[PDB]
Amino acid sequence: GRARDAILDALENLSGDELKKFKMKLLTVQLREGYGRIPRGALLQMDAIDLTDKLVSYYLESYGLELTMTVLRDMGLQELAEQLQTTKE
Amino acid sequence: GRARDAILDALENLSGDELKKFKMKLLTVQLREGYGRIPRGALLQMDAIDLTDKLVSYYLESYGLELTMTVLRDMGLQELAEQLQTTKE
Amino acid sequence: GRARDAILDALENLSGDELKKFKMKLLTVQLREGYGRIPRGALLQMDAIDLTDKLVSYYLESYGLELTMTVLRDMGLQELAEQLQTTKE
Amino acid sequence: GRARDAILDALENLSGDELKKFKMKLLTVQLREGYGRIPRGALLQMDAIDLTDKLVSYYLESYGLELTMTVLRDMGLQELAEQLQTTKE
Amino acid sequence: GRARDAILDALENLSGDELKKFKMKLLTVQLREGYGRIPRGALLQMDAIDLTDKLVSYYLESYGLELTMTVLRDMGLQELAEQLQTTKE
Amino acid sequence: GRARDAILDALENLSGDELKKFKMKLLTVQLREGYGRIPRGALLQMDAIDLTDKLVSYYLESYGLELTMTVLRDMGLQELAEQLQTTKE
Amino acid sequence: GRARDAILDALENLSGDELKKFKMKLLTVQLREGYGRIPRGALLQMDAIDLTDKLVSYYLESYGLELTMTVLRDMGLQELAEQLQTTKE
Amino acid sequence: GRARDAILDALENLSGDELKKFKMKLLTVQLREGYGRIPRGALLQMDAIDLTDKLVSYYLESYGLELTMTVLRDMGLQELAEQLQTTKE
Amino acid sequence: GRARDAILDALENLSGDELKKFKMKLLTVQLREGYGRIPRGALLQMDAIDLTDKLVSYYLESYGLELTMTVLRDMGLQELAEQLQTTKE
Amino acid sequence: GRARDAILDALENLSGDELKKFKMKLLTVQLREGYGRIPRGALLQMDAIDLTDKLVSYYLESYGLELTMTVLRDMGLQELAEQLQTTKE
Amino acid sequence: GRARDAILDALENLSGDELKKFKMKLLTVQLREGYGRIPRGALLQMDAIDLTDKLVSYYLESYGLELTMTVLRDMGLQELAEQLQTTKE
Amino acid sequence: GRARDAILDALENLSGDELKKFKMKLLTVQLREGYGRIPRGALLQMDAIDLTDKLVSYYLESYGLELTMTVLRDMGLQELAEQLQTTKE
Amino acid sequence: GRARDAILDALENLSGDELKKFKMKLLTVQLREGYGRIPRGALLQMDAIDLTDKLVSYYLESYGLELTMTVLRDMGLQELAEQLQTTKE
Amino acid sequence: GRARDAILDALENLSGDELKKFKMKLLTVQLREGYGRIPRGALLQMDAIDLTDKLVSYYLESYGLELTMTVLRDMGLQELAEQLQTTKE
Amino acid sequence: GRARDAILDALENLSGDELKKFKMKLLTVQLREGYGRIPRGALLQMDAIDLTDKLVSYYLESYGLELTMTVLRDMGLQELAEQLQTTKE
């Protein structure tokens, strides 16, 4: 599924500081019922590449891909949000 | 019964750390009446391949196969849970 | 009586360690009245094939065959228990 | 006993540094009479998951579960202390 | 006597390391007068299942069963100690 | 029949871990009707060289040789599968 | 086949971080039909040298060698991609 | 003799690294005449529990118990030295 | 002994820079005879929490607790020195 | 003569490895004149119980009993040496 | 033949990591016709000392000694290559 | 005929594992017409010394001696093959 | 060879930043034919002391020593270049 | 010989970085004739305590003790060099 | 002859790894004419104690004792070499 690769390419375009903000905010974001939550301990020491694999692991590609955008806009509208959306099509 | 082979292929796709979590959680999972429980001593030193053979040995293929998924989701929804479910059909 | 051959084929499918557990447990299992008990000395040094002949020798084929399953399940439900039961029919 | 699973889920939400503080403090915490103390050697190299199994092993689920909270608050009042308490009910 | 089977089931739930501690400690435990002591040579190479048969062989079921618990608590209070006690009733 | 020697030379080129996977998978592989199945007890403790002699003993050289490849590919396509096939010619 | 040695020499010229990216991306890369996929568990803990032997083991030298380049360019055009291509001739 | 058990309980409270220092230093410690020295080969691979049994085996309980403290202080004054001394009384 | 916990709570209230000054000065501080000195190698890489456990390990709680204050004042009179003294009472 | 029984009880308390050392050393030990030496061939395959009967057979109980201790201490001072000596009185 | 000893002394001067590289590369190195190839299974678990004995076992001392250097230089020119060559004279 | 003694001296220089390989391979080796084949049953339980006497018994010294080398090289070129050949002269 | 020690003493007199420049430039420097090139992966994470041992390992002391100066001047004429040259004499 | 203990106490007072420098320099230090050299492979992974035992093992206490100082001064004059010298007297 | 006992006591003071090196090197050591060589097969599986008896069996005590030292120094000068030499006097 190219989906895994798509997220990876974009996510890596964020600066070090914002990254923390993203990971941290993800912990407090609301998710659809029937899914689990990622343990705090792992998230704090995880890497950008690693985060990619795990992120998809918990959520399906289709639903998982959409969930990402929801958080990106939350931190403010980024060109990335739309850039990534193009992949959805 | 391809069932034995199906579980094997998927179970092997888990990382070393999660494996412990799976085996350990299995010990505390609730099972249907009329079945036995696996001894703690063996589980602690068993291998992934070995675990496959024994797992089916105690539980029937049909019921045994379903029991696995119940635990996989418990550790959180994994793509594996659904991937394996496809085999059920 | 194919019964002797049926038990033999299945019993041989057990691992070396479990075998001890089976033989040893047999000594403490409850039996119907009117039958004898097998001497401890012989059981400790007996072989899997030999055990087959002697096992039937003390108990009748019909009753002897059923007695085996009772012990197999006791060590936990094994696919063997049901597999062997099919022979009963 | 879901109790084992409840502790596990929460305990894993602590950061790596605090973990040491928790384990280390546990060694100096006062316990009710009639119970043993965990050996220092094992505690120093134990893992979060492993710690879960052993922790319950020494103390009963009911008493063991309550003992955990006593230590959590000691390190300061954490949302976890109350979150876990909900499980008590 | 189900007593032999009861001990067996529980004793097997101990990890490999603790097992040594149990066997070794048994050698230095105080016993009621009128009974013998088990030879060191055999104990060092004996197995968990074998240990079960011999353990009861030297001590009567009633007294033998109680003696076990005395040692289990000594290594610290284990859920096993109480779990096994239930069998006493 | 050089066939016995051919298999031997190649089979020995597998690592210790994969070996288990091969032997274990062989137990669940489908075989042509009119042939027997190898007892689980022996397979678990057999050696690589010994396995060679017995493997051919149950199945004819021609059919036996082909059966091996079927399993090798199953564990994934290995250079061995083709390397051994050359011997077929 | 010098092919095994050629890959080895070049692959070792990658920095530690990129290595992860390569291994991880390999898992999601599309492969020609008739071949297997490498288990996630092994890939995560494998070494650069070890990866070399296994990589060729699953895929033939000719096809295997070409597959590598396809992934190298994917991570971006590297001098290595062309440098290695020279070996193809 | 509770002496054997007393040493065991305390000795186990040392960290893995210090343990080596203790065992190694024991080899160079001066002992009273009329006693033997423990072979280097065994000491290097011995375990903490095992070391307990053997330690007492060579030296009498009374003299053996005192000898231990002499070495503990040597590695520096430890709370253990005094804690164990209490047992002497 | 709450003493271990008391020191811990206060010691942690020092800034990163002063910490070095404290540890380093401890190496050159005069101690009462009959006690050992802590190895330089360990002190340089030790942590604040770890330092707590070891600090008490070498010196008794009563004497160890007093020794700390002696050094705190040396680096200058701190509110901590008196704050900690209150614990002495 | 209880002497035969006394030796037997103690000798059996030695581990398998030390046993070899004892038997082997006995061959090179110096004996009082007027007595014979035991053939190497028999000693190598003899058992612990058997060794007891033969040991006394060659040497008188009084002198034979003392000779044993001489060798026990040689392998180092064992609690057994003194324990057995008590029997002398 | 001092040749066996010469290789041993030098080969042992390689670091753990390079060792793997050497053994692994040996498998793909070209050898003169009329000689056999060493089985992969043994090479993977062999030791440095053991490797010495076996290495000479397959190849004659004269030819075997020269073959080693050919591989050493391949991994790059090492002082060892020349140091060992001196032995040739 | 020193021939019998020559083979014996060399054959005994093989490790336990290779021995099996030799005996087993001998069963599948091609022999000149006019000679018999050794029964499988005896070969499996025979000893190295015994094998020497029987080996010569079936084949003449001259032809028998040459036949041995043919098999030694087959398992790969060994120094033994040539060492033994010297005896031929 | 004091040569190894000579380089070490001087190389350590370079500032952290220049060090990178040196190591990096070494990768692109031209070397005499018949020698190998050092892998990029190792160079990036190597230390100043370690670099010393390896640097000499690939190149002979005489030629290796001269090669160093060639690079030092390249980064500009340093007092070190001449200082080290004195060692050549 | 207190000599072994003396070295140990001082050697442990060196920081982690200098330790490497010491071990590495030892490899290139000149030694008196009639003695051996320590293998590079072991030195690289050895520990400070272990190094103590082995260091004395190769060189006599008297000569071995003096050899240490020679290297300590080489890395520069340290208070340790003189501190240790006091032990010589 | 105390000689047998002297060697035994010292030889046992070697670590497991060095032991292999000693036994293996013994096979390639040069011996005085008029003596035999020990078979490789036995040496590989022999024990330290057993090796003692056999070692003396082939060589006379006087000459045999001296031969040992020659090999000990070869593996490097050990304190053992001299320690054992004292016995010669």
UniProtKB/Swiss-Prot annotation, chains A, B, C, D, E, F, G, H, I, J, K, L, M, N, O:
Phenotype when the gene is knocked out: Increased resistance to endotoxic shock and severe defects in caspase-1 activation and interleukin-1 beta and interleukin-18 production in macrophages in response to several pro-inflammatory molecules. Mutants are resitant to vaccinia virus (VACV) but not vesicular somatitis virus (VSV) infection. They show lower viral loads in the lungs compared to wild type mice, they produce higher levels of type I IFN, IL6 and RSAD2/Viperin after VCAV INFECTION.
Modifications after synthesis and translation: Phosphorylated.
Tissue: Expressed in small intestine, colon, thymus, spleen, brain, heart, skeletal muscle, kidney, lung and liver.
UniProt-annotated location(s): Cytoplasm; Inflammasome; Endoplasmic reticulum; Mitochondrion
Residue span(s) of domain Pyrin: 1-89
Quaternary structure and partners: Self-associates; enforced oligomerization induces apoptosis, NF-kappa-B regulation and interleukin-1 beta secretion. Homooligomers can form disk-like particles of approximately 12 nm diameter and approximately 1 nm height. Component of several inflammasomes containing one pattern recognition receptor/sensor, such as NLRP2, NLRP3, NLRP6, NLRC4, AIM2, MEFV or NOD2, and probably NLRC4 or NLRP12. Major component of the ASC pyroptosome, a 1-2 um supramolecular assembly (one per macrophage cell) which consists of oligomerized PYCARD dimers and CASP1.
Purpose: Functions as a key mediator in apoptosis and inflammation. Promotes caspase-mediated apoptosis involving predominantly caspase-8 and also caspase-9 in a probable cell type-specific manner. Involved in activation of the mitochondrial apoptotic pathway, promotes caspase-8-dependent proteolytic maturation of BID independently of FADD in certain cell types and also mediates mitochondrial translocation of BAX and activates BAX-dependent apoptosis coupled to activation of caspase-9, -2 and -3.
Domain notes: The CARD domain mediates interaction with CASP1 and NLRC4.
Protein name in the entry: Apoptosis-associated speck-like protein containing a CARD
Organism of this sequence: Mus musculus
